[PDB]
Structure formats: C-alpha cells, structure tokens
Design a binder for this molecule. Sequence first.
Ligand SMILES: CC(C)(Sc1ccncc1-c1ccc(C#N)c2ccccc12)C(=O)O
Length: 515
Amino acid sequence: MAFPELLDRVGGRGRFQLLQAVALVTPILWVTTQSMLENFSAAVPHHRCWVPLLDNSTSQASIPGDFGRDVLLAVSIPPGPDQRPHQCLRFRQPQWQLIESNTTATNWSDADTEPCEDGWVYDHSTFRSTIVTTWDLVCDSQALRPMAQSIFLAGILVGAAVCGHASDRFGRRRVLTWSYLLVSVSGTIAALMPTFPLYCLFRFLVASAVAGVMMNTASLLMEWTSAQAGPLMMTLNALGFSFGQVLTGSVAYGVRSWRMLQLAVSAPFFLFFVYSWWLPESARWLITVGRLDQSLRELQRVAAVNRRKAEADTLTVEVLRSAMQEEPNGNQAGARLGTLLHTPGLRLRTFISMLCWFAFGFTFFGLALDLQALGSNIFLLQALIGIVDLPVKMGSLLLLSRLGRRLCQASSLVLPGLCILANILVPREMGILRSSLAVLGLGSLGAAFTCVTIFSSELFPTVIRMTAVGLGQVAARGGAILGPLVRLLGVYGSWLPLLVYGVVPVLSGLAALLL
Ligand SMILES: CC(C)(Sc1ccncc1-c1ccc(C#N)c2ccccc12)C(=O)O
C-alpha cells in the first residue's frame, strides 16, 4: 500500500488541514515584515552641514544683528542643485558679502568650503531616528546601505542552503521551531548593538533563519495534504506575503524609532516558537528514514483530530513498512545536475527558465527597498503594493485558461517592465501619475512570482522536476544580491538605475515565450 491511500483514509481536506494552514500562514506576515523593514528602519531624512552660528547657542547669543534664519542659512551654506542648501559643504568663514543683492552669488570656488567636520543636522518631522541618523552614513559613506541589504540577501542564501541540508537530515518541525527561536533571538540582539558591523552580522543571522523557516513552512504545508489541493496551499502561502506588506505599512505607521520598531517586529517569533511544539511532524519523511512507530503515532493523532478514528483503527506497522518499501530512491541526485545540461533538449529549457527566475529577484528587490524615491508618502505607498497585488494575483490565474499557456509568462513580465520605463519620461510635475505607475509596477510583480512556480513543474519531467525548481531558486536569490548594488550607479544619473531595472524583465519575458 502506498502513502496516498493512507493519507486518504486518514483525511486530506479535514478541519485539521484548515487549522494547520492558519497556524502556519500567520507567521508568514511577520516574516515579510522582517524582510521589508529596511524600508523604514533605515530611511534617509533631510540633512545639512552643522553650523557654528546656527546651531551653537554659545555663538547664537553673540550674533550682531537680528537677521532671519533664512538669511543665516544663506550666509553659512551654499545653495544646492535643488535650490536647497548643500548637503556636504560649509563656508569655512562666515561670508557676509552674500547679503548684498548687488553681487551675483555664483562665483564660489570649492576652496572656500570645507567638509563637515562637526557632524550633521537632520530633520525630525516624520522620523525620530534611523540608522542613517545614528551612524551618519551620509556624503562620504552613502554607499553603505546597499552593502547592508546585499549582506542580508547573502544571509538568506546561505541560510536557505544550510537549513535545507539540516532539515533533510533531521526533520521538518525541529528545524522549523529552532529557526523560529533563532529569528527571535537574533532580531532582539540586533535591535541593541552599538556599531555598524555588529548590526550587519546580526541582520545576516536573522536572514539565514528567516530563509530556513520559510522553506520549512512551504514543505510542511504542501506535504500534509493530498495532491488535489496543493495549488490552493501555494496560493495561500503567496497571499501571506501581500498581507504582510499591509501589516508592515501599519506597524511602521505606528512606531517611528528604529530600535523600538525592530523590537516590535522581532518579538512575536518567540510566541510562535512557544506553540510550534504541538504541531505533528511530517509522517512521510519519518517513513523514509525508518522510524515507523513515530509515523504511526502521528497518523493516529491527525486521524483522531478529524473525527476519523474508526477507519484509522486498522492501521498497523507492516503496511507502513510496505509503504516504506514503495518509497522512491534519491540516489540519482548526483547526475541530475549534469544531464540537465548534457541533453540538448533539456539545455535550452533551463537557460530560459532561470532568466525567468533571475529577472524576479533582480527587479523586485532593487526597487521595493527604495520606496523613498518613487514617491512621497511611504506609509501609504507601502500599503498599496499589497492591496493591488491580490486583484492581479487572482486575475492572473483566471487569465491562464482563456489566453493559453505560452502567453501567460510573457505577458506577466512585459507589463511590469514597461511601467518602469515610462517612469522617466513622465514629467516631474505630475507627481500623482508618477507614483501610481510605480505601484502597478511593483504590485504586478507579485503575480509574476506565482506563475513561475506553476510553470516550472509542467515543463520538466517528473523524474528531474525537483532539480529544475531547485536551480530556479538559486538564480532567483543570486540575482537578488545584485539588486541593491545597482543603485550605486546613480552618480552618473538619477535615471540610469530606472533604466536597468526595467529592461531586464522585458528582455526576459519576451524571450520566455520561445518555449
Ligand atoms: C523567497 C525569496 C528569497 S524573496 C523573499 C525574501 C525575504 N522575504 C520574503 C521574500 C519573498 C519571496 C516570494 C515573494 C512572492 N511572491 C515575496 C513577495 C513579497 C515579499 C517577499 C517575498 C525568493 O527570491 O524566492
């Protein structure tokens, strides 16, 4: 007797599945919050060079003449390109000549200015303090935020790999609960460190544990149900992320100091760890290893939950042993990576599939972590990304049946791509339309992820199917690391980052219909 018959006589759609779906989807919201917090915990508020005559009340008490604050600001700080005071320069000697309008204040050499040797002054209109304010990553080290985000994503990658191996060797629920605890502890410790490298290291560990819990949640959610309702489980696991975006919006609107926000986001994972003990472990994996009694215990439990004790009373050890004998082998795992490239018919089916996976990690994270520039109100913008995602996410599954197979993937990438290209041409005065085009861009990229998981399976044969979706996972992560690093090239122009981020999916999507 095979395992599906046992899962059939125990219950696949019973209430137990609903309870487990709720209890495992709820933490996905907070995982999304931890992943997206870098948009609010490290914002860049306005800044100007520290001034002796403006800031120090000692010199403020000795000022000859009661001039307006705008006058003093014009005297101390040269103007900038946006008619605002310059952000990294200061007049070395108070220039009183600038007051007279008879002299056109335009011939100022950089030799008359000096770098800010007395710190900076930030505005506290909407943010009380962020790490940009705390450690002054401005005007010389402004390239240290993409470094932090790249470190976070590298942490996700390494943690995913290590936790995958460990969960294959140890179990699902064990690695799940220990990853919960690791997220909680590492977040708590990261919310109090005094210097920057320690903050980076503990963000690394947080991301590793988050990758672990995400993968194990996916596996456990898919495994304990029948093959009929799998895609519904994947759909719920996808909706978790959008609801997490909305939660991030609300929570960030709540708290404005990066330490308290970080603690509030990292707290409830201990509560999740505290109740992760009552969930029954996966029985199929236990059958694979060979601990039959444990599997029978878990099966009797889950059957007793669904009010199906009578039929499960017949379960015995020998039928589980025969099921183990019917379990397939994974010895061939070594040569699957080779034959994916060796056979010509399978070479091209991969080189296109990865560019579908790589284009998502590169375009999404390169923008969704820079919501400061693509609009004005961050709290409302962060919320709309999650709200719009659901209509597109539900609509895309409808479009599958009507427009066909090949035309689904190609369509769900050109549309998010062309909106980013149109961002530069739209005049800077029309701020409303510039923001609305950004939301539809980042929002529609949610359904782009849902489709590639579905189309990954039907392309490759079932023998090597697990391997192909595996490599698609690495190219998606390995591309995310190169996401934020692109924003370094903004020094050449403010439009160039918006050019690279949108051309990649269009060149990916239009090339995906060739399958
Ligand atoms: C899962 C990752 C590593 S990305 C990621 C990293 C950290 N935390 C959440 C996500 C994430 C994954 C799939 C999503 C989808 N759809 C999604 C949607 C919104 C927000 C986050 C994600 C990937 O590249 O596969």
